[PDB]
Amino acid sequence: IERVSGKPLLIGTDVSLARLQKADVVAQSRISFPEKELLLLIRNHLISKGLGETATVLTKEADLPMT
Amino acid sequence: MSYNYVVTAQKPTAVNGCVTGHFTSAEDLNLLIAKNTRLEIYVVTAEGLRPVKEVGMYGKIAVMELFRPKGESKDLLFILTAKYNACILEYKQSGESIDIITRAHGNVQDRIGRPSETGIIGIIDPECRMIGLRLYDGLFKVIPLDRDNKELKAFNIRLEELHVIDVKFLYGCQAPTICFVYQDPQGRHVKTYEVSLREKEFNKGPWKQENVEAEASMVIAVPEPFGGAIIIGQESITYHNGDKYLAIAPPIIKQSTIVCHNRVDPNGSRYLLGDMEGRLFMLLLEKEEQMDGTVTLKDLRVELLGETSIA
Amino acid sequence: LSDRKKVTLGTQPTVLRTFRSLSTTNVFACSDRPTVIYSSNHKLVFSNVNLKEVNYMCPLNSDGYPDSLALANNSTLTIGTIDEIQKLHIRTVPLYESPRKICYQEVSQCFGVLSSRIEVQDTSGGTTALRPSASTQALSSSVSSSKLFSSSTAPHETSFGEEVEVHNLLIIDQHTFEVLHAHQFLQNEYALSLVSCKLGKDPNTYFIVGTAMVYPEEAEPKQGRIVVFQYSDGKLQTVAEKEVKGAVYSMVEFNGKLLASINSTVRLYEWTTEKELRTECNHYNNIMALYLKTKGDFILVGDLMRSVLLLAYKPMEGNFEEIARDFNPNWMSAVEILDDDNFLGAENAFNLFVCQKDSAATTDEERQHLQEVGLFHLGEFVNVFCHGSLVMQNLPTQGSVLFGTVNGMIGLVTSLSESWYNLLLDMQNRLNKVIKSVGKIEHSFWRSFHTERKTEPATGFIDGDLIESFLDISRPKMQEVVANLQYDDGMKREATADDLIKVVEELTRIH
Amino acid sequence: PPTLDSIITEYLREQHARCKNPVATCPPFSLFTPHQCPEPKQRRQAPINFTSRLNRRASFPKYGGVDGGCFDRHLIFSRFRPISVFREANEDESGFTCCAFSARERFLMLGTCTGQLKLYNVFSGQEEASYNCHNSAITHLEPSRDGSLLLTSATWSQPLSALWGMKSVFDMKHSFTEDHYVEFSKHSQDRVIGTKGDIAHIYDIQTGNKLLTLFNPDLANNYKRNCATFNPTDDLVLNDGVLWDVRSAQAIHKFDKFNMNISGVFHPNGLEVIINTEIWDLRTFHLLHTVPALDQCRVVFNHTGTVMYGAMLQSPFGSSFRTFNATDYKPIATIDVKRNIFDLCTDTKDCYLAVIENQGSMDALNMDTVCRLYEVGRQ
């Protein structure tokens, strides 16, 4: 099944063949993302876990849309 | 036996294909609207539009595109009927004598096969080297343009890809090259190719682009400074140039299907878009000078421009 | 000076004047046939006016008419101005939604236009529109009652507002053209068929709409009803309905009886005094019957895929009877009876042909077979056919059929005389050696009947649009058209240039 | 070691694998919204309903737009109705084998077990004129299109085919003794090709000579039922499932063997070769498709080549019908005949089905073969 399809490196998963060339595209895609969506996730984690005395410090490095 | 009489009371009014250029004069832009069989030669004034000569023909005009070959100060017009008889038109004026010269013609068709599904599609090479025609669903009929052709010769290079949705041409890259939107059995992609007219054979393509959006309807090729191929879909818009890629998904284009386009600026900086419901959009390209000679793309803007008729 | 040219206007002495309507130096012919001389698509072809007889004109100065002129005649004095001059003046009454059909009321002074509006489904509300067309902006609104498709649990839920269609009946005013009434139908109920006539011994003049119930992700429908309306004192009334197992495609009036076409079953009706309908007869030998045209007591049925089907109606028996049937499978587009012997049919392949009813009734096999007589490639899709001409009645050719298209190209179909057919067809072959059409396209090749399987050359009809360009031909090239040809004036004469130009003008006065 | 530039990289990718038809050059993401790749949403397609294909075609071209052509044929070749029953009331039992239609479709040319073809009016229901043609039986029976010739083949009779004349004079114009099965040529009808066993012979009708005998034992699939056929451009021959150049008398390419019986037919678009259930190419010889309902059936087309028929040759004979599409091979309908089907022929003008069916059960001692007509597209 590996030979007549897109050659996975002997990983045993999703042995159907229509589900094997789905795994050709989803794996080799080029995912990129903006950094701004992640920096708000950092600040939303610090305030919730007790140590929120650097949320005001993060005004300097980048923007602060929410308080 | 029954003998009856048929004339035209009202000349046809609905339009089909609109090509601008320099058909009448060298430094005068004009408009060439075909409607059913008529070919209405307008000209553009600063106040608006003005006709010159209305010419009808024996066949439904469905594909038309001007082109200036190397060797002509003015241009030529190519028109294919619905009955597969082609013609190359040339305007001749001598004072008030206003004439249309057909330079070369010839009915090119085949004995066998399904005609098509999405009508007839025809696009001219920008270097004026070949003439595209999708005619019999598996053949890709190419017209070798020359002054050797007092009548039209024809090639039929086989498409191994059968069900083609769109086809276009890409701009100046030393070789006349093609773009598809082909429906595979398993997925759908955008393949390219390269035709050797001296060898009648597809060459090895520069792009592969093995999977694209599921509803890719049209291909908008951008010109020689930053050449590539925009792939409009139902829901999103990409860009491709073989190495890089850009993609957006603007919330404007969410309730209508893109149907029409045009190259507004001669360096391809802006593009207008219509829909199935009357809207007009604008594609703004953020031209980025990376180096002292490098031209590349930075951003894709879609601006709502208002409501008109169904374009 | 150049050559003279005799053009007939009437029996009294004429007057030719020029003036200023508003600008552009408008020119008028004050004659027994009052014509505008100035322009017709920037060309010297006369265009009439809407006045009977004009003797003089007078450039007056009216306070409510800018730069208008009065017309001293054998009748009253008309201070009026003249608009953009052309052959066919076109006045637009916009409604901003898809029209479907048109009927006419004589007794009521109103039209009827079936409509089509795009709407999306709201999550909370029922539906919602997209832009303010003239459907919601009506003088009176109503909705259908007696929801009689309630027993069928077919209307299941949809997720989003994915562009359902809503139809209603628009009764348009006679002269103000204001939308008088709107009657919104049930959900996903199309409006497919509309006429306006009288049924039985009831002197009321009705609107009759035969509808169908539609769903996507579905085959051909088996539901629907037929609704008959009236316009009592400007108010629309639903009198009676008849729930019919099938989609209704075409309806024509038949001698006081209602003819319909319900899924390959020609189903003629009958009006009773109990305000109902009774199926008088039926028919079942059809693929899918979409077209119905009547003239007297013949009924011409246009099939889906096969052909022209002529069906008789014997009033003594009370039931239909198959006289004949064509067998060659052409996909019909629209059909029309000419003269109850010749039957005009269109096609999806953008073509025309007439089947003639067979004369030599030597046996029973050869009298049930129609014969395709004449072929033509009308290079245009055909939607409509109707009677009636566009010229004034001066009380030549016989009859007139106009046809509706998809590119806005209205033409005329009429009948000739067989002596003139030999006169006209030979002139087509003379002009097909002189006229160099653009493309170097043979007109015998272009008008040839070309389907995917028949490349049979055309015969029968006359392409008069090739004829009427003879006026544009110069006389050093008109002289070569006139070879040793014939002329009928039982008689026999060699053709001449000044008479062949008359025969074209005998056809140009129609159009 | 991993960072957030590997976890958030992999957090979206397994979220990306729930995209029905995913993408490759994806748009930029949004972590506070779900991710769903653009689904196929059709707007340029004609709808599944037919009356909504009728409103749309009024303001659009021919069919209703893109994908409006087959949606007519999925409503109009899925129903049939019997027209009339044709017996052989001479020995009070019917013994026909083969059937076809005439060049103008007025008479249907049956063929008995005795050796005579019997004409019948399609309108009347009365014998016109029988013809003592062969001795053994009748297997194959076709006219031409111009209305001049007739090919009738026998089972074991010492001349096997009989090139008749149907103009005015009934005589075997030429005679073949060798070949089991012949056929006309499609485009130019100057060729009648003949094949016994596995060897194909190209003949003429003017002279009757072996024009080009082609056979290569080096490249023969060697089936059970070979039938030499021309492409509709009249340039290729299928001898034993091999393409054959008629120009320079050489073989082209052999196909693989799968069910031991059927050699291969052409499809009327001139693009394919239909081996029994393998659907090939003509310029690169690849496989397009493989249908499990094409197990050992003989194909019957429309004259334009837009619908395909199927009859089983299993032992039973043709338990039901089989109606295929000639573009993408999606099957339309299999309506059922309770008896066993033997021969199946349709019109050039596409209105009837000559059905030779088997009355009674599986009995070699009693075969009652009536003839029945079906109307194309009527409930």
Instruction: Give every CB contact of residue B190 below 8 A, 6+ residues apart in sequence.
Output: B179, B180, B181, B182, B207, B209, B212, B216, B219, B229, B231, B240
Query: Are C322 and C263 within one domain?
Result: yes
Judge whether D244 and D231 are in contact, CB under 8 Å.
no
Query: Which residues of chain B have a CB within 8 Å of the CB of D269?
Result: 112-114
- Pairwise CB contact (< 8 Å): B245 & A30: yes
d(CA B86, CA B63): 10
- Decide if C68 contacts C47 (C-beta within 8 A): no
Tokens of D133: 């043609």
Min CA distance, D213 vs chain C (Å)? Answer: 33
Tell me how many degrees the CA angle B4-B5-B7 measures, rounded to the nearest 5.
155
Contact of B202 with D36, CB cutoff 8 Å:
no
CB-based contacts of B149-157 (< 8 A; 24+ apart in sequence): B149/B104, B150/B104, B151/B104, B151/B105, B151/B106, B152/B86, B152/B88, B152/B104, B152/B105, B152/B106, B152/B108, B153/B106, B154/B106, B154/B108, B155/B197, B155/B200, B156/B110, B157/B195, B157/B200, B157/B201, B157/B202
- D377/C305 Cβ within 8 A: yes
Contact B252, B302 (CB under 8 A): yes
- CA–CA gap between residue C48 and residue C29 (Å, rounded): 9
**C-alpha–C-alpha distance, residues D192 and D203, integer Å:** 5
CA-closest candidate to residue B112, choices D282, D244, D232, D302: D232
Residues contacting C507, CB < 8 A, separation 6+: B5, B7, C397, C464, C467, C468
Q: CB C197: neighbour CB atoms within 10 A? A: 16
CA distance B285 to B264: 12
Chain C partners of B4 at a C-beta cutoff of 8 Å?
338, 342, 344, 354, 374, 413-416, 460-462
CA B64/CA B264 separation, integer angstroms: 19
Whether residue A18 and residue B245 make contact (CB cut-off 8 A), yes or no, is no
The helix (run of H) or strand (run of E) holding residue A38 is helix A36-48
A38:D28 CB<8 A: no
Q: Which residue has the tokens 């075997």?
A: D172
The answer to whether B85 contacts chain C (CB < 8 Å) is yes
Kindly tell me the burial class for residue B306, based on how many C-beta atoms sit within 10 Å of its own C-beta (0-12, 13-18, 19 or more): exposed
The verdict on A27 touching D (C-beta cutoff 8 Å) is yes
Mutate to test the interface with A, among B210, B240, B246 (most CBs of A within 10 A): B210
Annotated resolution, angstroms: 4.2
Residues of A with Cβ-Cβ distance to D32 under 8 angstroms: 37
State the virtual CA torsion across B31, B35, B36, B38 in degrees, nearest 10. Answer: -50
CA-wise closest residue to C251 among C237, C266, C230 = C266
User: Going by DSSP bridges, is the β-strand pair B4-8/C462-463 parallel, antiparallel, or unpaired?
Assistant: parallel
Cα–Cα dist D378/C288, whole Å: 9
What is the pairing mode between strands B63-67 and B49-56? unpaired
Q: Write the Ramachandran bin of C42: left for phi over 0, alpha for psi from -120 to 50, otherwise beta.
A: left
- What is residue C104's three-state secondary structure? coil
Residue range of the domain that includes B203: 15-311
We report the CATH number of the domain holding residue C317 as 2.130.10.10
DSSP at C470 = G
For C360, phi then psi, to 5°, come to -75, 85
In angstroms and rounded to an integer, the radius of gyration of the C-alpha atoms of chain D is 26
Look at residues D160, D157, D171 and name the one whose alpha carbon lies nearest to residue D201. D160
DSSP label of C392: -
Distance CA D136, CA C185 (A): 69
C–A touching, 3+ CB–CB pairs within 8 Å: no
Question: Which CATH number does the domain housing residue B161 bear?
Answer: 2.130.10.10
B211–A18 C-beta distance less than 8 A = no
Closest CA to C338 of C353, C350, C322: C353
- Nearest Cα to C211, choosing from C100, C331, C128, C335? C100
Residue B156: list chain D partners with CB under 8 A.
none
Longest C-alpha distance within chain B, in Å? Answer: 79
Q: Which two tokens stand for residue D186?
A: 């499609």
| Phi, psi dihedral angles at A58 (to 5 degrees) | -80, 5
Rounded to whole angstroms, how far apart are CA atoms C217 and C224? 17
B158 reaches D (C-beta below 8 A): yes
* Residues C350 and C443 occupy one common structural domain: no
Strand partners, C324: none
Please tell me what DSSP assigns to residue C459: B
Using a CB–CB cutoff of 8 Å, tell me whether B106 touches chain C.
no
C-alpha atoms less than 13 angstroms from C-alpha of D97 in its C-beta half-sphere: 18
Subunit contact D233:B111, Cβ cutoff 8 A: yes
- Beta-carbon separation of D22 and A30 below 8 A: no
Beta-carbon separation of A25 and B245 below 8 A: no
Contact C327 D349 (CB under 8 A): yes
Put simply, whether B118 touches D (Cβ < 8 Å) is yes
What is the distance in angstroms between the Cα of B290 and the nearest Cα belonging to chain A?
A: 21
Distance, in Å, from the CA atom of C193 to the CA atom of C250, rounded to the nearest integer, reads: 6
Q: How far apart (Å, rounded) are the C-alpha atoms in residues C450 and B215?
A: 35
Residue C289 and residue C336 share a domain: yes
Tokens of C159: 């997720």
Handedness of CA C217, C219, C222, C225 (dihedral sign): positive
Establish, for the pair of chains C and D, how many residue pairs have beta carbons separated by less than 8 Å: 68
Helix (H, G, I), strand (E, B) or coil at C148: coil
| Contacts with C390 from chain B: Cβ below 8 Å | 9
Given a contact cutoff of 8 angstroms between Cβ atoms, the answer to whether B172 and B126 are in contact is yes
Q: Give the rounded distance of the alpha carbon of B298 from its chain centre.
A: 26
Partner chains of B (3+ C-beta pairs under 8 Å):
A, C, D
Residues in CB range of C279: below 8 A, 6 or more apart: C267, C268, C269, C270
Under an 8 A CB cutoff, do D25 and B234 touch? no
Q: What is the 3-state secondary structure (H, E, C) of chain D?
A: CCCHHHHHHHHHHHHHCCCCCCCCCCCCCCCCCCCCCCCCCCCCECCCCCHHHHHHHHCCCCCCCECCCHHHHHHHCCCCCEEEEECCCCCCCCEEEECCECCCCCEECCEECCCEEEEEECCCCCEEEEEECCCCCCCCEEECCCCCCEEEECCCCCCCEEECCCCCCCCCCEEECCCCEEEECCCCCCEEEEEECCEEEEEECCCCCEEEEECCHHHCCCCCECCCCECCCCCEECECCEEEECCCCEEEEECCCCCCCECCEECCCCCCEEECCEECCCCCCCCCEECCCCCCEEEEECCCCCEEEEEECCCCCCCECCEEECCCCCCCECCECCCEEEEEEECCCCCEEEEEEEECCCCCCCCEEEEEEEECCCC
Polymer length of chain B: 311
Domain match, C126 and C257 both:
yes
Q: Which of B138, B215, B276 sits opposite D40 (nearest CB)?
A: B215
Separation in Å, CA C477 to CA C472, C502, D218, D284: 10, 17, 71, 57
Contacts of B210 in chain A (CB under 8 A): 25
Does the CB of D49 have a partner CB in chain C at under 8 Å?
A: yes
C369 and C433 in a single domain? The answer is: no
Residues C337 and C300: beta-carbon distance below 8 Å:
yes
Q: Which of D17, D29, D32 sits opposite A33 (nearest CB)?
A: D29
Q: Quick one: CA torsion of D250, D252, D257, D259, rounded to 10 degrees? A: -80
Q: Tell me how far apart the alpha carbons of residues D159 and D177 are, in angstroms, rounded to a whole number.
A: 4
Render chain B in DSSP notation, one character per residue.
---EEEEESS-------EEEEEEEETTEEEEEEE-SSEEEEEEE-SSSEEEEEEEE-SS---EEEEE--TT-SS-EEEEE-TTSEEEEEEEEEETTEEEEEEEEEEE---SSS---SS--B--B-TTS--BEEE-SSSEEEE----TT-SB---EEEE-S---EEEEEE---SSS-EEEEEE--SSS-B--EEEEETTTTEE---S-------TT--EEEEE-TTS-EEEEE-SS-EEEE-SS-EEEE--TTTTSS----EEE-STT--EEEE--SSSEEEEEEEEEEE-SSS-EEEEEEEEEEEEE-S--
Give chain B positions within 8 Å (CB) of A21.
186-187
- Residue C360's contacts (CB-CB under 8 Å, 6 or more residues apart) are C366, C367
Most C CBs within 10 Å, among D41, D42, D44, D52, to test the C interface: D52
CATH number at residue C431: 1.10.150.910
Q: Which of C212, C306, C348 has its CB closest to that of D51?
A: C212
Determine the structural domain holding residue C503 and report its residue range: 416-511
What is d(CA B122, CA B61) in angstroms, rounded to the nearest whole number?
12
Residue A47 host element (H or E): helix A36-48
Looking up tokens 């159009």 gives C511
Q: How far is CA D166 from the centre of its chain?
A: 26
- Do C306 and C376 lie in one domain? The reply is yes
Contacts of B218 (CB under 8 A, 6+ apart): B166, B232, B258, B261
C457 and C326 co-located in one domain: no
| Interface membership of A26 toward D (CB under 8 Å) | yes
The CA dihedral of D194, D199, D202, D206, to the nearest 10 degrees, is -50
What interhelical angle do C418-431 and C497-508 show, nearest 10? Answer: 110
Residue of B nearest to D44 (CA): B257
